[PDB]
Design a protein around this nucleic acid. Sequence first.
DNA 1: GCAGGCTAGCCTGCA
DNA 2: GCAGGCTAGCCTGCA
Lengths: 122, 125
Amino acid sequence: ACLSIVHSLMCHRQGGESETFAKRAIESLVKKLKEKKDELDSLITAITTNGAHPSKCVTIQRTLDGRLQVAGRKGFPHVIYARLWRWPDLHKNELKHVKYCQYAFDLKCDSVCVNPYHYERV
Amino acid sequence: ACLSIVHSLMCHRQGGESETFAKRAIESLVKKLKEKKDELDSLITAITTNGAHPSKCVTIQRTLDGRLQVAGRKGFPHVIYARLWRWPDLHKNELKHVKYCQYAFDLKCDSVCVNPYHYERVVSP
DNA sequence: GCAGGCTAGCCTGCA
DNA sequence: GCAGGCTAGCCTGCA
Ligand SMILES: [Cl-]
Ligand SMILES: [Zn+2]
Ligand SMILES: [Zn+2]
């Protein structure tokens, strides 16, 4: 079910993290999108087609400091997933959201867009 | 739980429908957004400020045929809420979605955006 | 567990 | 081929 989805998404990882961390990060994200069909499908089709066409926001709940914990490690959620699928060498303060993103990290909403195609590297 | 949201939204109705119809339409929408905090806040702020600043999509589940039933009446959900808060005289095929709307009626997604400020009025062909 | 109300989905009657 | 009406299924207020 989710295991089938995870594996397809793992095939697009850029190697900027260990296999165990990437699996942990993907499983965590997929579980959160299990009851959000449209957003899950937006993530899968944007990852696979390399953000060819505009995609919908893929959101998760924002924490107070804005950091997500995956396998005992903390980091910004939009950074973790942009590093994972687009920029393995991504650093701090290198991500600027696209104009059409509604839940971009910087907006400090209750939700964060972790769609890596909703950010451009700067 | 919170009927204070329904009351504040009822104050912005344009009178194109009966008080009873409007109350049922708003109650139905608010119940669907009860566990979607961001979407509910985007709706309240968009209505109150007359869509001054860009707002997020306010979505509900799409039915098979696209129509929503409220108080025994069926209609397109984006039309029902655009009539209620923006155009009381609104007719069929007079809405066109804004470029930044992700869940527009026309896209036939799982979800339908009912944010009236995510649609602009057009002349029917 | 139960009473009762709301509506998506299905069906039909005029067109 | 639509508009609109009927109701199974789902949900909730209840004691
Ligand atoms: Cl009204
Ligand atoms: Zn986004
Ligand atoms: Zn929208």
